[PDB]
Write a protein that binds this ligand. Structure first.
Ligand code: HEM
Ligand SMILES: CC(=O)[C@@]1(O)CC[C@H]2[C@@H]3CCC4=CC(=O)CC[C@]4(C)[C@H]3CC[C@@]21C
Length: 442
């Protein structure tokens, strides 16, 4: 009993792949097989099927596949995000996860506060001007992850311009069609590809960045004490966990931690531009509690619910990452053979009317206490949960909390920014370019 096979091939060509995938549940239910590219792959479109796979049968669906680009990004050192589930992988995740949690425990909260403080002051420079916020949230969250991974040396040797430019190049190349098409149609590897050589140049530049940073930490490090995440990770190292593991864990922190959180922030802005009743309510809630520390989260319940909603309705990683079946198993009473690739449709699953009534509507009050509905999972779940989720949820709180108290968000000009996501971009859910006006005071 395999999951039902949906007819057709090259479904890839559909714009809004996660919303098209939700469309096939019409005939085939939450769990079905379909041919993306050449390959047969099962897709999950419900919170039940996703949690049943990822949480319940924990180890059965914790793997990753290995198409061309996965090998290509990690020819020197092992990658964490694209690494298959093993003992060595589990230690890999544990270390970098302890680096985020314990390593920067005292500094994570102040680094965020201070950097977003300077963001608001840069916003201050042009009071009426329409601002291309997207890039400004991108520089913020990139600076934050850089400072927390690499330390003081960033604003000293003035490394932020060159690092941002590198981090951006790397993701932007990799997620583009000319590179992604090779993972699904692997015979295309033999036909010449400028794109893949644009990628190799980006890999080379990111590897030079991380490695120079790695040397400089090693030579200055103190045996008991840790300044940032690389200090912590270097110290918990040396199938043993090597310095190559640290190198890639930094790569995953950098690339994983800019565009994801920054775009979520951008989406929140667009939603508030469409909902100025909510903006005022949020502002008036902030006025009633001169910053709010992250320790005082409970004290802003509507703000938290608004963040939860942004995550529900617009998850920035809408298809998560592909999963691989580690041993023969089953989801929803269908036989799942070993090595079959699983696509966890998070955007689709959050649009379920079974779970979230009026599921297409930006409705923050939905997450408020009477009859509160089930928690969304924009960060995924199980063994493969987003590594930088704590850092992200902090960044989201501090940045919106300070933007709203210090400013009012007005539309760029006459018409509100398009809420519809860019069509062919699935990897990162990005919105159509927009400007916003920031006017003191909230
Ligand atoms: C709103 C912000 C963010 C969202 C919605 C988000 C979402 C996700 C999702 C859905 C996955 C894949 C889950 C799966 O494979 O089942 C993921 C993986 C990951 N994320 Fe994030 N993420 C966010 C921010 C960050 C940040 C800030 C970092 C790092 C600083 C980060 C690092 C990672 C890493 C390293 C993985 C791979 C983990 C693994 O493969 O097990 N993410 N994230
Ligand atoms: C949310 C997500 O999925 C992530 O942001 C979390 C981890 C991210 C990896 C990290 C390493 C990497 C190395 C490269 O040189 C190309 C781009 C990737 C594959 C990069 C893309 C986006 C990922 C997959």
């Amino acid at each position: 009993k395999l999951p039902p096979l949906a007819p057709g091939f090259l479904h890839l060509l559909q714009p809004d792949l996660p919303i098209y995938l939700l469309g096939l549940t019409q005939k085939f239910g939450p769990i079905y097989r379909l041919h993306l590219g050449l390959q047969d792959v099962v897709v999950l479109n419900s919170k039940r099927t996703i949690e049943e796979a990822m949480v319940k049968k924990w180890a059965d669906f914790a793997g990753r596949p290995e198409p061309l680009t996965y090998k290509l990004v990690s020819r020197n050192y092992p990658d964490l995000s694209l690494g298959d589930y093993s003992l060595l992988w589990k230690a890999h995740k544990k270390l970098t996860r302890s680096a985020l949690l314990l390593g920067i425990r005292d500094s994570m909260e102040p680094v965020v506060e201070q950097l977003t403080q300077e963001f608001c002051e840069r916003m201050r420079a042009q009071p009426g001007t329409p601002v291309a916020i997207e890039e400004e949230f991108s520089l913020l969250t990139c600076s934050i992850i850089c400072y927390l991974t690499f330390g003081d040396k960033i604003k000293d040797d003035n490394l932020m311009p060159a690092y941002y430019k590198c981090i951006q190049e790397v993701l932007k190349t990799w997620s583009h069609w000319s590179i992604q098409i090779v993972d699904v149609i692997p015979f295309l590897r033999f036909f010449p590809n400028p794109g893949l050589r644009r990628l190799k140049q980006a890999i080379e530049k990111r590897d030079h960045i991380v490695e120079m940073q790695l040397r400089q930490h090693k030579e200055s490090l103190v045996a008991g004490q840790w300044r940032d995440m690389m200090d912590y990770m270097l110290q918990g190292v040396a199938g043993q966990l090597l310095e190559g593991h640290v190198h890639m864990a930094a790569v995953d922190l950098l690339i994983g931690g800019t565009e994801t959180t920054a775009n979520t922030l951008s989406w929140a802005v667009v939603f508030l531009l469409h909902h100025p009743e909510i903006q005022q309510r949020l502002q008036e809630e902030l006025d009633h509690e001169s910053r709010v520390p992250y320790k005082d989260r409970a004290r802003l319940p509507l703000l938290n619910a608004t963040i939860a909603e942004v995550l529900r309705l617009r998850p920035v990683v809408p298809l998560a990452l592909p999963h691989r079946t580690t041993r023969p198993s089953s989801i929803s009473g269908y036989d799942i053979p070993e090595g079959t690739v699983i696509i966890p449709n998070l955007q689709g699953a959050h649009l379920d009317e079974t779970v979230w009534e009026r599921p297409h509507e930006f409705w923050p009050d939905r997450f408020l206490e009477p009859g509160k509905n089930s928690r969304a999972l924009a960060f995924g779940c199980g063994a493969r949960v987003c590594l930088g989720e704590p850092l992200a949820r902090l960044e989201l709180f501090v940045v919106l909390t300070r933007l709203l108290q210090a400013f009012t968000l007005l539309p760029s000009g006459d018409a509100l920014p398009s809420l519809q996501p860019l069509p062919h971009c699935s990897v990162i859910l990005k919105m159509q370019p927009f400007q916003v006006r920031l006017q003191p005071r909230g």
